[PDB]
Every structure is written in C-alpha cells, then in structure tokens.
Curated annotation (Swiss-Prot), chains A, B:
Cofactor: binding comment: Binds 1 [2Fe-2S] cluster.
Subunit comment: Forms a complex with heterodimeric ferredoxin-thioredoxin reductase (FTR) and thioredoxin.
Native source organism of the sequence: Spinacia oleracea
Protein name per UniProt: Ferredoxin-1, chloroplastic
Cofactor(s) this protein requires: [2Fe-2S] cluster
Taxonomic lineage from the root: Eukaryota, Viridiplantae, Streptophyta, Embryophyta, Tracheophyta
Length: 198, 198
C-alpha cells in the first residue's frame, strides 16, 4: 500500500499574489488505486488553493490491495514554487461526521511573544498554528526530527504519532509539535530544537 | 509496524567544531521491537558521529508483530542542534553482503557549476551528493515534495520510491533527487523546484 503519483500544481494566482498557503484534505482510495470522496478540511487563505488541489487529486494514483478510507494530507505551498504533500491521520471529523471535534486553547510562548488559538483535538499543534498564520519551525513533519521541538508547560498532549523523543524526554515535557494533538488547553514554548538535542 | 522511540543525541564535539554531518546505518528489529545487528554504512565526516549514533540506537524502540531485517536510516546533523532521522530502503549491500554495489558517475549541473562523484546503485542521488559534501536542497526527504527537484539530461534513474511526480513529468525528465537511484552514469540539473511546479 503506497502512493505512486500525487502531483500538485502551483496556482499562478498564488504565485502572483506572493501568498504562501496550506490545504488539509480528506480522501478515500479505491481498490484500483484512484482517489474519490475528496473533501477539503481547511484552506489558508481561502479561495486560492483548494479548488485546484481537488482537481489535481482526481489524477492521483496509489498501489493498493484493497480500498482505504479517510486518508488525510496536508499540502503546503511556499515561495519560489515549493509544494509538499504530507500524510496525516484521519478522524471521525475528517471523514465528514456530524458535529465538531472538541477544541482546546493553545497558548504558544514564542521568541517574539505569546499567541493563542483554538486547536481541534484531531489537528496537530503545528497545523493549527499554521492555520492561524503563525510560522513555526519544521522539516520532516513526520515526528522524526528536532525541528518542531517545544516544551510543554501546562496541560496534556497526545504524542502517539511522534517517534524521535524517548520516554524520558516526553516525561520531561518535550513535544514534537508536528505530531502532537492537544487533549486539554496547553501552553507550549516553541523554537526549542537546540535545547532538545543539547 | 512502526518506530516508537528513536532518540539521537548531538555529539558535543561536532557542535564545538561547527561540523554538520550525516550517518547512514543499517539495523534489524527484534520481535520485541529492539534494535540489533547495527552497522554504519557511511559517516561524513568520519569519526565524529558514528560511534555515538550506534550507542543511541541500542535504546531505540519499535512496535512490531515480527522481526524485521535490514532497515536503513539516514541521520542528518545540522547547525543549531538540528537532527533528523529518515527511513530509506535496505539492499544486499546495506545488509553487509560480500562485494560492492555497482557504482555510477553522477554529474550535477548546479547554479554554481558542475560537480561529479560516484553513486552506488543502492544509494539515492541526494545522499551520495551529501557524502561528497555538496549542499543540495531538500525538505521532506520522502519523495513527496518539489524541494529536491532536478532535470535528468542523460542516463537513466530508478525513481520507484518517489511519488510527487506524475507519469508525464517523469517522462519529461523530472527527478526527485532524494528518492532516485542511478542505474547508469547520469547528468542532472539541480535546483529546479521552481521550474517543476510552474
Ligand atoms: S518537523 Fe520533524 S518531528 Fe516535527
Ligand atoms: S525532499 Fe521532498 S521529494 Fe525530495
Ligand atoms: K469511502
Ligand atoms: K537479522
Ligand atoms: Ni514515562
Ligand atoms: Ni510514461
């Protein structure tokens, strides 16, 4: 089971406007490996990337032994033509269920001051920060490096999807923000990569 | 089957020396999820990161239904405490087999001029360029973005491990250098991300 072809085109209007952006989208895969049941979960900013991404996804291809439901990706667009497609985890809410995920208030303590936003319980800290237009560090986006490291000051997180931290570090409050969901209101100090690996 | 804890520490001597680096290492996983049969494949530069990485890997943890052989990761160390662990694909050669993989000459045509090095048939273009001390762009390292894009001018590649390019783009000569192996001598123009997604 794996992706074969997942091309995304860069919308010329975004390029022209000098807009960076982000789409999170859910889809199913058929036993033939084609993509259907596509639903945009979020698009930042709105009306620039979503429609084009859905069009592109019609031509995606996977290899699979059976249909697969409720896949989710993040599609990030940055300056100078950069696009990346990152796999995330589907939830009841991503699949299109009735009602809204519980959401919690995230307080980030950043080198340039504090910021606060809502984060659904099925969205990673990083993603919700990006949706609020905050620029947090990252590189792998796969819970497998130090880039997105922060320190949890209060509250509780689910970091089941991370892997670069050991037991000890999690217990000491370390967080990989690309792979962590809030399960309460939380306060996280960001930009702590260098402190993590020291 | 998945990684749970893969902590790597930053060697203080590397920090002090202002050295960036890279280790590629093979290991097996036990049915208990512990790591054994560890062998460094390459370390750049030598004698700075390898021994410490092997020590760290003794404490790694996986979840698994059965033992798994001949896993390989790349471990990259950059300035300001950055470490990332990226999964790659094992080969006869990574497992420790007799004799050497066939190797091919890679010619890179970079914005700052041309460079040439050997690349084994079981090592990705990006990795071999990094081992030769060339700084090529990348971000996901998972064949799922535009960052490492180049244009294949001559020769042939295996890009089975990539997924962001479609059929058409591969046929036109596009290459994701983080996920491409040479199967002949090749010439690749690098730094073509913006041209790819345009
Ligand atoms: S960006 Fe690598 S662990 Fe979050
Ligand atoms: S770095 Fe993303 S495809 Fe190579
Ligand atoms: K379905
Ligand atoms: K073994
Ligand atoms: Ni613990
Ligand atoms: Ni073709």
């Amino acid at each position: 089971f794996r992706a074969l072809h997942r091309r995304v085109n860069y919308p010329s209007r975004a390029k022209a406007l000098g807009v960076e952006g982000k789409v999170r989208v859910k889809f199913d895969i058929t036993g033939s490996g084609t993509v259907t049941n596509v639903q945009v979960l979020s698009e930042t900013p709105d009306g620039v990337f979503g429609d084009d991404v859905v069009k592109d996804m019609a031509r995606w291809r996977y290899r699979t032994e059976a249909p697969v439901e409720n896949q989710v990706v993040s599609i990030v667009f940055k300056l100078n033509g950069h696009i990346r497609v990152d796999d995330q985890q589907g939830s009841a809410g991503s699949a299109g269920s009735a009602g809204s995920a519980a959401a919690y208030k995230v307080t980030l303590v950043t080198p340039t001051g504090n910021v606060e936003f809502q984060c659904p319980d099925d969205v990673y800290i990083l993603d919700a920060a990006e949706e609020e237009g905050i620029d947090l560090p990252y590189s792998c986006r796969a819970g497998s490096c130090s880039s997105c490291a922060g320190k949890l000051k209060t509250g509780s997180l689910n970091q089941d999807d991370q892997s670069f931290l050991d037991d000890d570090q999690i217990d000491e409050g370390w967080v990989l923000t690309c792979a962590a969901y809030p399960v309460s209101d939380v306060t996280i100090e960001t930009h702590k990569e260098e402190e993590l690996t020291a």
